[PDB]
Design a binder for these strands. Structure first.
Lengths: 169, 92
RNA sequence: GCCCGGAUCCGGGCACCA
RNA sequence: CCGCAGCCUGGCGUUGUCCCUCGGGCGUUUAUGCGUAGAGUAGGUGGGAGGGGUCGAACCUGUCCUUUCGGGGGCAGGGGACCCGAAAGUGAAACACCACCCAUGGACGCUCGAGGGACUAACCUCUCGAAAGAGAGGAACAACGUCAGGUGGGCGGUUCGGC
RNA sequence: ACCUCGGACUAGGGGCAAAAGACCAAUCUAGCCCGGUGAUAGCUAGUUCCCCCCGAAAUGCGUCCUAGCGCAGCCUCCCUAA
RNA sequence: GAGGUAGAGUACCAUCCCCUGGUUUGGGGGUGGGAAGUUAGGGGACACGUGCCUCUAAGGCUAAAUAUGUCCCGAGACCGAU
RNA sequence: CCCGAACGGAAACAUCUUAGUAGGGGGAGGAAAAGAAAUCAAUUGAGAUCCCCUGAGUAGGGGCGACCGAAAGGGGGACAGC
């Protein structure tokens, strides 16, 4: 399939990593949460459940890498509980990126994510989101589970793929 | 105190009195990967105070001098109880 | 326990949870 | 008694293009050597008294480099051909030839570093622009993330024996 | 560097101080409310009916121990044993 | 009988931090490196090798068995105006 | 689902415990969450998840101090799979 060859050009250590560097220069200027027209990696999107119907949207999110933005305590602590450096959010940056996308698009449900790039200050992810109220999605037989109100806003309760991994499941 | 280099005592392997060569005891290297050194390093990761007690007050000035005797026929070694002295002058 | 310098000892900087 | 922030410094990442130099190594390339007794430069282990000789030698005369100028190492011609000992000294002899070592310097192809210089397109700063985008200056440093060492009553927890 | 009024800003290990540890709603060498929380107290006070039988110790050693405890000594109750 | 397919910054490694009974062995996160891909991968209490045994990560969904009590019915060696 | 103490106990106290508790922020439902083995155990066996009685204060962690602490297996309740 052509999807097998998409993953080969974007694989590991390649001349393609000269093309991808040029994109990053543009991506650093666009807003931190943007809707994009088409997935950058169709192999990753189609495996996670993206289709070419209307109601599927693609969002790119950039976050800031590093550890937790943790302040030094100001009241009295034992020496164990006074340390700052080395802490990272037990939630992954992949799960943090999905959460910020679900804030800006409150009518869509997160289906998956994968990252696309990385530089010295940010990490970039792309999130697959679907509109559960469009009549095209409402009639789909493979997403009939998405008509249950318990299956909405799952990203906030750790029920996505990135959340299951981080819960030790 | 002076002690000879060679002493004739009982070799329990040979079951008789044989010649022995005399030396003073000296310890080895601490050998990281000892179980109590693996545990100490596992305890020093993270945040906290000084983890373990460390001696500060010292009273003794000498140390117990131990003699090591090696049986010159079979290399069997007997280690003797120590005794508080200044420095055992082992020269013959 | 070290390195190093100086006449086994001395000095300097680092090693060292009964 | 201890911790933790802040600060200083180094590694890794973001971080790229051209050089030059130096120091390591790998397979090669080569030519250079005086504790004393003595024909005299024994630095050492061996084959080796034969090795060179129209299968062209010992010798005078100079250009030249060098050294504890001691003295040896290389130049063609004049010479158409000669010297070391198996012999004399040395705790260890043959400039009798050939090998390796200690040890000097340079060069080939490869690797690793370490330093210095330049550049602009990342990154940063400013200006214009509603935005899109354009211009100027700096620049692979700064800045940020992460790890490591130092400093650190700035702040936090505590201990401050007994009779 | 005068006195005073209305509006506004600064919030608790924080503010504001022509500096007294002053002031921050009669509260300040760290405000108040609610929660942790019925915090801990070898220390102090109280601890509610009758009769009957037996009946002490204020000593030794160890203890960051001498206003406390552990091990022995001394009281009481039961079984055995012969 | 012959051929084709099987989920990537993912598994894993070093280091730092927090959890954990997880201890030279478990889980998650930050930083750096980073596969194989069916002639493949994972696991079988330190690490590796050889047999044997067992499974298929990195894409979702899924009744019943249970947790609660604002509320409605019933019950009770509950209280009885401090 | 993330962030996250101290009082107290250790007869002092800092690793530890208290406790991932109290608390803070975000998101649901009449239930939530989990859920169809890259699982267990051992001479080649069992067979998704959850809850109760056990295994068991066992293996194991710890100034190896105070203290902390499983899973497999056995008996049951429901017992689907795409």
């Amino acid at each position: 399939s052509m999807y097998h060859y998409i993953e080969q050009t974007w694989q590991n250590k390649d001349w393609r990593r000269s093309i991808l560097r040029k994109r990053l220069i543009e991506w650093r200027r666009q807003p931190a949460i943007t809707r994009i027209d088409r997935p950058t990696r169709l192999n990753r999107a189609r495996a996670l459940g993206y289709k070419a119907k209307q109601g599927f949207v693609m969002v790119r999110v950039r976050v800031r890498r590093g550890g937790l933005n943790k302040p030094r305590p100001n009241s009295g602590r034992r020496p164990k509980r006074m340390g700052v450096y080395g802490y990272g959010p037990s939630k992954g940056y992949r799960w943090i990126a999905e959460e910020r996308a679900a804030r800006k698009f409150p009518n869509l449900e997160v289906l998956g994510s994968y990252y696309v790039a990385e530089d010295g200050m940010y990490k970039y992810y792309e999130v697959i989101m679907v509109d559960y109220s469009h009549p095209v999605i409402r009639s789909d037989p493979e997403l009939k589970w998405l008509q249950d109100s318990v299956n909405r806003k799952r990203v906030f309760r750790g029920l996505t793929s990135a959340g299951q991994k981080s819960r030790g499941l | 105190m002076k002690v000879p280099k060679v002493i004739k005592t009982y070799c329990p392997k040979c079951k008789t009195h044989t010649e022995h060569s005399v030396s003073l005891y000296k310890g080895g290297k601490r050998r990281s990967l000892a179980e109590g050194q693996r545990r100490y390093e596992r305890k020093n990761v993270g945040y906290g105070s000084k983890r373990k007690p460390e001696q500060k007050r010292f009273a003794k000035t000498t140390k117990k001098q131990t003699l090591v005797l090696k049986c010159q026929k079979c290399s069997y070694t007997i280690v003797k109880e120590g005794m508080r002295l200044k420095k055992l002058e082992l020269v013959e």
